[PDB]
Amino acid sequence: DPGDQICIGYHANNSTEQVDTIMEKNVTVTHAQDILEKKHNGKLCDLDGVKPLILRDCSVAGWLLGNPMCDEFINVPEWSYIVEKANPVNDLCYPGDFNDYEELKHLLSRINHFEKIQIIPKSSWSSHEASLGVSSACPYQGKSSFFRNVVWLIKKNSTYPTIKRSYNNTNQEDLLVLWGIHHPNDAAEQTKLYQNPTTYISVGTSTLNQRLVPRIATRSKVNGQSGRMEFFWTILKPNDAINFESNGNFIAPEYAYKIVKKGDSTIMKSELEYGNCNTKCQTPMGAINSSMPFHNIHPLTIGECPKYVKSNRLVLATGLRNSP
Amino acid sequence: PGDQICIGYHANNSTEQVDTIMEKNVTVTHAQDILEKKHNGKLCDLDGVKPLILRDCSVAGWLLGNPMCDEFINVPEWSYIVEKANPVNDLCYPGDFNDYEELKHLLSRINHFEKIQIIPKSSWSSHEASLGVSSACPYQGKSSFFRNVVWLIKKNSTYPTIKRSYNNTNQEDLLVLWGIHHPNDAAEQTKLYQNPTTYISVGTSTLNQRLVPRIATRSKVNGQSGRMEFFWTILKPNDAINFESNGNFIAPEYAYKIVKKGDSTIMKSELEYGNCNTKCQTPMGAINSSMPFHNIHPLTIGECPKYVKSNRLVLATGLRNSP
Amino acid sequence: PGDQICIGYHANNSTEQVDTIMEKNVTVTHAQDILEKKHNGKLCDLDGVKPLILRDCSVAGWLLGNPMCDEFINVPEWSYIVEKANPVNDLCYPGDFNDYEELKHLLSRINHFEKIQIIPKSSWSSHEASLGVSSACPYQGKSSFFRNVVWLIKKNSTYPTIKRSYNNTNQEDLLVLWGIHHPNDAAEQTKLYQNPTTYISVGTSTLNQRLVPRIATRSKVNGQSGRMEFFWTILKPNDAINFESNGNFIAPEYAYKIVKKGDSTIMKSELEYGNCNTKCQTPMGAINSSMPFHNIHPLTIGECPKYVKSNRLVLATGLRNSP
Amino acid sequence: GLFGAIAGFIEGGWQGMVDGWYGYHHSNEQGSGYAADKESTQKAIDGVTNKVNSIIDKMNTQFEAVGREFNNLERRIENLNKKMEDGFLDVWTYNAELLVLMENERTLDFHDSNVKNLYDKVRLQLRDNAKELGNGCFEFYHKCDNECMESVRNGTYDYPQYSEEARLKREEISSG
Amino acid sequence: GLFGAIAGFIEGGWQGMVDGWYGYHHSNEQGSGYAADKESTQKAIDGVTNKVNSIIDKMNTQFEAVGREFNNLERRIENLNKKMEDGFLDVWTYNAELLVLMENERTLDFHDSNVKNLYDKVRLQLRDNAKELGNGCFEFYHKCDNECMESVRNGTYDYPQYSEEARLKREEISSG
Amino acid sequence: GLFGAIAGFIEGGWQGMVDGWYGYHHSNEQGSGYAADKESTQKAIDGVTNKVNSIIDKMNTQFEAVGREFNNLERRIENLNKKMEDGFLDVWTYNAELLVLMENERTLDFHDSNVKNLYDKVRLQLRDNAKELGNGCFEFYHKCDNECMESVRNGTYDYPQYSEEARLKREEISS
Numbered sequence A: 001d002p003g004d005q006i007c008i009g010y011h012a013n014n015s016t017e018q019v020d021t022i023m024e025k026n027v028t029v030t031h032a033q034d035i036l037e038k039k040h041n042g043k044l045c046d047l048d049g050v051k052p053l054i055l056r057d058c059s060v061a062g063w064l065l066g067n068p069m070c071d072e073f074i075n076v077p078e079w080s081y082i083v084e085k086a087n088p089v090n091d092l093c094y095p096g097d098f099n100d101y102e103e104l105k106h107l108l109s110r111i112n113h114f115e116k117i118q119i120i121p122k123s124s125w126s127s128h129e130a131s132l133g134v135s136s137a138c139p140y141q142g143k144s145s146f147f148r149n150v151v152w153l154i155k156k157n158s159t160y161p162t163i164k165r166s167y168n169n170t171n172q173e174d175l176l177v178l179w180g181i182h183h184p185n186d187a188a189e190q191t192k193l194y195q196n197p198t199t200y201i202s203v204g205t206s207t208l209n210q211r212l213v214p215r216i217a218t219r220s221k222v223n224g225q226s227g228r229m230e231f232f233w234t235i236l237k238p239n240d241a242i243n244f245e246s247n248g249n250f251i252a253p254e255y256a257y258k259i260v261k262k263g264d265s266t267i268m269k270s271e272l273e274y275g276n277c278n279t280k281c282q283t284p285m286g287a288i289n290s291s292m293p294f295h296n297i298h299p300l301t302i303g304e305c306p307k308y309v310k311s312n313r314l315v316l317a318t319g320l321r322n323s324p
Numbered sequence B, C: 001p002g003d004q005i006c007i008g009y010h011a012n013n014s015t016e017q018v019d020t021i022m023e024k025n026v027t028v029t030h031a032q033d034i035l036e037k038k039h040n041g042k043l044c045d046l047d048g049v050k051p052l053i054l055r056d057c058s059v060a061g062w063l064l065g066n067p068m069c070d071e072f073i074n075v076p077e078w079s080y081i082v083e084k085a086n087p088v089n090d091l092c093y094p095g096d097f098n099d100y101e102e103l104k105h106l107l108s109r110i111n112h113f114e115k116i117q118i119i120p121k122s123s124w125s126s127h128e129a130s131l132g133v134s135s136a137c138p139y140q141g142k143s144s145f146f147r148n149v150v151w152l153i154k155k156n157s158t159y160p161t162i163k164r165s166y167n168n169t170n171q172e173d174l175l176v177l178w179g180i181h182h183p184n185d186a187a188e189q190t191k192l193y194q195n196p197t198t199y200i201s202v203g204t205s206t207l208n209q210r211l212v213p214r215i216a217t218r219s220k221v222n223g224q225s226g227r228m229e230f231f232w233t234i235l236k237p238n239d240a241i242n243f244e245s246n247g248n249f250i251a252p253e254y255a256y257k258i259v260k261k262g263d264s265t266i267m268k269s270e271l272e273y274g275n276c277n278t279k280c281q282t283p284m285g286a287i288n289s290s291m292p293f294h295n296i297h298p299l300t301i302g303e304c305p306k307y308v309k310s311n312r313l314v315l316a317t318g319l320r321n322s323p
Numbered sequence D, E: 001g002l003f004g005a006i007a008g009f010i011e012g013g014w015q016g017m018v019d020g021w022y023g024y025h026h027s028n029e030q031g032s033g034y035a036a037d038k039e040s041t042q043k044a045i046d047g048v049t050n051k052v053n054s055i056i057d058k059m060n061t062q063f064e065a066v067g068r069e070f071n072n073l074e075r076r077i078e079n080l081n082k083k084m085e086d087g088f089l090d091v092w093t094y095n096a097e098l099l100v101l102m103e104n105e106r107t108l109d110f111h112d113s114n115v116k117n118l119y120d121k122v123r124l125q126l127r128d129n130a131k132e133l134g135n136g137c138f139e140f141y142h143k144c145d146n147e148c149m150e151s152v153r154n155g156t157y158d159y160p161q162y163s164e165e166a167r168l169k170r171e172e173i174s175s176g
Numbered sequence F: 001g002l003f004g005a006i007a008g009f010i011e012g013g014w015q016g017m018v019d020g021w022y023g024y025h026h027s028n029e030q031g032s033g034y035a036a037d038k039e040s041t042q043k044a045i046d047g048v049t050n051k052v053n054s055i056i057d058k059m060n061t062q063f064e065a066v067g068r069e070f071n072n073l074e075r076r077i078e079n080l081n082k083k084m085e086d087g088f089l090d091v092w093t094y095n096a097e098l099l100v101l102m103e104n105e106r107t108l109d110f111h112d113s114n115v116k117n118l119y120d121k122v123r124l125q126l127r128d129n130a131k132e133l134g135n136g137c138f139e140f141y142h143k144c145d146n147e148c149m150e151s152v153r154n155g156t157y158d159y160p161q162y163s164e165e166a167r168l169k170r171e172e173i174s175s
């Protein structure tokens, strides 16, 4: 007679989850764990309740110099990260260059809030013309205008006396100071605007020892202008002073930026704009809300994020090979 | 004795060996070498496209037109460029090439130039355009100069102010080259350009340049104490470049239209043309292989295996072969 | 009951633990630690060669000859250089050191200098060579200056045009240092150099430099609103360096001949000499170990183990130890 | 599989065993049924959980890309930056994918080994008191009630308690 | 080896078996000969091929060095570039070499496991109808002609057809 | 363990066996005692030594950090340099730690496999001349003196030499 039996066996179910191995692909297993997040909400959200600075059609230079088409950002509140488009149309309205621009953007990556302060009043130029430095290249409401945070000074009564101005940073925070120089089209324009034929702009702090000289050249018209504006910046430390001296072509500071909050930020390149949402992990393509340890959305993220990999699939086997 | 059935495994006379973590030189019945270690030691065409082999000329000697580089006055489309470590034909008249490495980087993405005359040498009616020659740049025993630029000299003891423009009416980007002469002393300044205080201004939509000559006594290189300093820009379609100068101007004559862009490279090698064709090129030679890896040289171009520093890469496929 | 033979395995009282993917803190009978975690906390000689420990002096203070750095007027051959994070003896007279980080990188491949006087301080017959001192550069309470350069001053209300040349007749490369003074105002310019509009031209086979003083009002640093800006070059054998200047010239006196090159480094550390010898040095201390890994500091020099950020690395060699 | 148990001499799994990864099916006079082996199942659960957590934690220190910008005359360093970031991303993608592949193989073989070890545990308990059928089952030479089955499942089977009955049955079978 | 078959209880390989990696050698009244086991050999071939292809494809996205040039006052970034490219080359060389070592070990052990599993397949088919000689061979207790041998090789051996003859032979041997 | 020998059907290790990793314990009329298996222990020693040396040598050409300095207007390339060096350090720390974890697991399983293979060596030598007790021990059906035990230990056990005595003992037990 057949005796009693005991059998050893293993679990099986109707799972269709598959994993790969070195020697075999698409192994159906009873249990598996997906570890790759592949979904995002396609929106730019606040980072832990802090709204980002979304520059829209303005560049960082257009914001900081005060392109008159960027009045939305004349005084911005604290931000969590900055969003800039690939090619913002509102940049240097008057054409030219921004010296060490990428180094300044790198500095911005560690700043969360500016406070704009007037360091040199536009009305304090008693020996120079301070209200004629406007151009059709920088329109505001149909009128010729200019960058709002600097002043394009012009000769007064056919004379341009030597400017000697100082600003002492009596604040407790670092100060981002911006100024510029005008490179005119020819010697005739040099005489017409500044009278003096040979000019300079000397700038000094405890560390800065600068002397700019205008470069006259014949150039292609950009935004209708063949002249150029070249802008320079420095970080003025507390209790340090900045000294300007110039006999022409000076694009003087009016407003500077106190660095009132430092922290972890970034300049995210994205064509998206505000999505009226909140998140813990932000990418240029959208926000991530996930418990997965990995994601493949975008390598440049900010916040508490999973680790980025280029994988299209990452599935760990947890159970055993599933019997059909 | 009853019938028998035995379970066993393959064996052969293979001597192929593989390594493992716990044991080296394990003889196996079957193995696959995955490392290519051989090359033909030649510089070949890349899929039928001949490389530009500069021989004794540098990239600067080619682009400026060092008169010892006439072999490259008009080069056809290339697949990659080959430059020696220290080409003897470089800046025949000594000096500097501004942002030279950035230009070489740009060249790494260009496959063909078309030379174009942007300012005719014969169009200099108020200046001497055929006296700017030097013994530092010999051609066939006579004093000469870079062929793509013009060393302008005063005419009848006068150097009128030059104002010249070129508008890029082509559909392709234009590589434009010019220069400035830094003379040895003020007497030479007067001798060559009459005007004691000179400048060169250059403008495009983005370029805003004003150069001033630096007059000083320097060590002689190729017999010259003066220096030539060369500059370049990419002139975009429909943009114009404007030059103005009252002396020391090394004016453009020929510029380079960028007619084909693609994947290229500047390969450093002492080898020259080998009259061959290949699918994968390294500075040491060409590779013709189906192996997934190679150890020839890390800098390759074409459809190549992956480079590793390994001396051996053998995968076990069969079983441990019994002696 | 029949005879018996049993199969078994080793066990002991080992408490050494290892980790695996599926299980942590696995007690094994035998294990091998492969991570060195100890150092002596000292800066030692590297295989018998003592390092150059700059103490309170920076590289710039050493090379220019900050009068507070007289300990390093003549240094013997070194194995590596030690510099503090913020040396207090740097540019005593405030200013800038041009391409300073490139110079430090060069220093990382140099083991010994030989000081040579290229322009004797006593050879300035038309200028004042012993008046260029400042309270910003004190020595024993006295106004002084960088010792390897000379702050030249006008003589009898005149500053004739300087034209000096030095030909490197040595067989080794020469590190040459000079500078320019940017004064506060035009009155100081006239007081020091008489000539209101000045320049410094410097030339070699490769260098073509023309510096112009920047007269401006600046914040006081070490009591000075003026600035000193220093420049350097490597003068190759048989090349000459030419200086010309009508003011503001901080002339060379001593240059540095590169007499021994090798693999070195500039280590940042607050420690000083520990009167010891080692084969492996880190900024935190020396390592004496046979283990293949260490976690002391990533920046090491000598025959060192490989650095990892691990706190523990133990290989299992024996079997799982039965309790 | 490497250990020949799963889809080996045990052809397939049991859909009827839901409360565990490995276990037993018994059949005696009192009836038949499934019973998951808690100890091996829990050891496998602990092993797999520690494995997943170890993989995740070993990817704790992977490269994090940072946005950097360069102007038109910084193309060399811009290209260097791009190649550096892409290189590290490729390295860590390779690490993740390869580790997942290798540990998936090891996990499947680990389950196979656990099944084989459970089978061998029962086999070495029963010895010649039961006959090996070759399909994962043992046919007892003696009566094995539910308490006997449980003694087999928990590893406390008493061979001498049934050895004489098994010997009588074996002699009856061998004698034909 | 890890599984004790290759160069283990089976001392050596067969030069006479050329058409497969694993197989059988039979000897009965009708003669003797080798016969490769197609199923296990083909499974091993598929496994090894997939392994080789997986290694190659996992080295698909490795670092590609690019030539960049720097002037005499760019030594810091020149050195950064050199160290970065050398670093990635060293990382990928390490990846390739280590993967090859580890998977070579796993391949040898995989062949070992396949041999052991084939042996156990035959063993569990035959059960007590044959005697385990301890060297990889089984000595039948019954006559096994070519049809019987082929049923063993293809996995369709019918134990009850020979069980009584084998039992008679076993009782005759045990009784003397 | 993967092979079910160590801490498996062999419940524990032997503190009394000191001269080897694996071996035997015998018991016959002449007495009992331990004896390390020379060959398998030497094989394991060679394997583990080669493993350690292979790991160390595969870490021979790992990344070596180099000090580079940058000024206040070179923050981008300074950050690039820092991230490059930190990245390579993290890559090699991962390589070391992961290789150690994986090979430690393989080493423990290797010892397990060696124990199991030794057990199977004895089992396939003895066949039905001894009875499998299920705890790592075999009880002979015939008298096995010290020379017989040594023939088992060195792999030269002569099954037909004792098969008839073992068969008689099995027949007596079966009755």
Ligand SMILES: *[C@@H]1O[C@H](CO)[C@@H](O[C@@H]2O[C@H](CO)[C@@H](O)[C@H](O)[C@H]2NC(C)=O)[C@H](O)[C@H]1NC(C)=O
Pocket: A168, A169, A170, A239, A240, A241, C219, C220
């Ligand atoms: C800016 O003004 C402050 C006071 O309003 C000056 O403060 C002095 O700072 C120097 C260091 O630069 C100290 O040595 C003094 O003790 C400070 N005095 C006081 C009263 O605070 C500061 O010097 C000014 N900045 C400049 C560049 O002159």
Ligand SMILES: *[C@@H]1O[C@H](CO)[C@@H](O[C@@H]2O[C@H](CO)[C@@H](O)[C@H](O)[C@H]2NC(C)=O)[C@H](O)[C@H]1NC(C)=O
Pocket: B219, B220, C167, C168, C169, C238, C239, C240
């Ligand atoms: C520095 O002095 C050396 C002499 O010591 C000069 O070397 C001569 O160079 C010319 C080439 O112009 C050779 O023909 C001579 O044979 C060299 N002389 C010796 C003795 O070798 C060198 O030219 C000088 N450097 C400068 C810049 O004038």
Ligand SMILES: *[C@@H]1O[C@H](CO)[C@@H](O[C@@H]2O[C@H](CO)[C@@H](O)[C@H](O)[C@H]2NC(C)=O)[C@H](O)[C@H]1NC(C)=O
Pocket: A220, A221, B167, B168, B169, B238, B239, B240
């Ligand atoms: C170079 O020449 C071209 C052709 O004359 C100019 O292109 C014209 O540009 C204007 C706008 O500035 C358009 O309205 C015309 O339709 C364009 N013509 C053609 C044929 O495309 C170009 O402006 C010139 N560039 C400069 C810098 O003067």
Ligand SMILES: *[C@@H]1O[C@H](CO)[C@@H](O)[C@H](O)[C@H]1NC(C)=O
Pocket: A025, A026
């Ligand atoms: C695995 O299955 C997927 C579909 O789920 C299929 O796209 C893929 O080609 C399969 N891979 C192999 C190797 O069969």
Ligand SMILES: *[C@@H]1O[C@H](CO)[C@@H](O)[C@H](O)[C@H]1NC(C)=O
Pocket: B024, B025
């Ligand atoms: C392996 O064999 C090569 C010869 O092919 C020999 O040079 C090498 O030393 C051997 N390695 C070992 C570990 O014996």
Ligand SMILES: *[C@@H]1O[C@H](CO)[C@@H](O)[C@H](O)[C@H]1NC(C)=O
Pocket: B288
């Ligand atoms: C090189 O490649 C060509 C085309 O694929 C082939 O005909 C030739 O045989 C190859 N050379 C060698 C040596 O295999």
